[PDB]
Homo-oligomer: A and B are copies of this chain.
């Protein structure tokens, strides 16, 4: 397991729209090793999520791994995630970011999101996230779209 360097706020890599993962990357040692190194980076910093741009990889891969301080959730790796629907109900919750290590704040998020994504093997999954996990999905997708949580306060 490798801990990768993390991009900080002010770095341009964090403001791009990340490129989708191609079909021939699915089920590849390349994609497993990218996700493993992202997972290790997230755990090193006690994060609950991570997005490939934060480790200088402009690709649509995220990890969501909730814990209470809310489910205790083992990391789920999402390739090419797409939020199909944001709920009408909207709640404010505390967020931090590995790319903004000095600040936390309250961000308004959809209470639930319907998310479609590919596993590392390339299986299509659709799941509805609620609560803290929903906030983490919305945060990580914002990283893929060049958006930091401080821009949403």
Binding site for B on A (CB under 8 A): 2-5, 7, 11-13, 15-16, 18-20, 22, 24-25, 28-31, 33-34, 36-37, 56-59
A77 vs chain B, min Cβ distance (A): 15
User: Which residue in chain B gives the minimum CB-CB distance to A38?
Assistant: B30
Neighbouring B residues of A56 by C-beta, 8 Å = 18-19, 57-59
Which 6 A-B pairs rank lowest in CB-CB distance, beginning with the nearest? Answer: A56-B58, A2-B30, A2-B28, A33-B33, A30-B37, A5-B22
Most B CB within 10 A of own CB, among A15, A20, A58: A58
Neighbouring B residues of A34 by C-beta, 8 Å = 30, 33
Contact between B33 and A4, CB atoms less than 8 A apart: no
Contact between A19 and B2, CB atoms less than 8 A apart: no
Neighbouring B residues of A7 by C-beta, 8 Å = 19
Neighbouring B residues of A58 by C-beta, 8 Å = 13, 56-58
Neighbouring B residues of A29 by C-beta, 8 Å = 2, 29, 33, 36
Determine which of B2, B20, B25 lies in contact with A24 in the assembled complex, contact meaning CB atoms within 8 Å.
B2
Contact between B19 and A5, CB atoms less than 8 A apart: yes
A50 to B36, CA, bound (A): 24
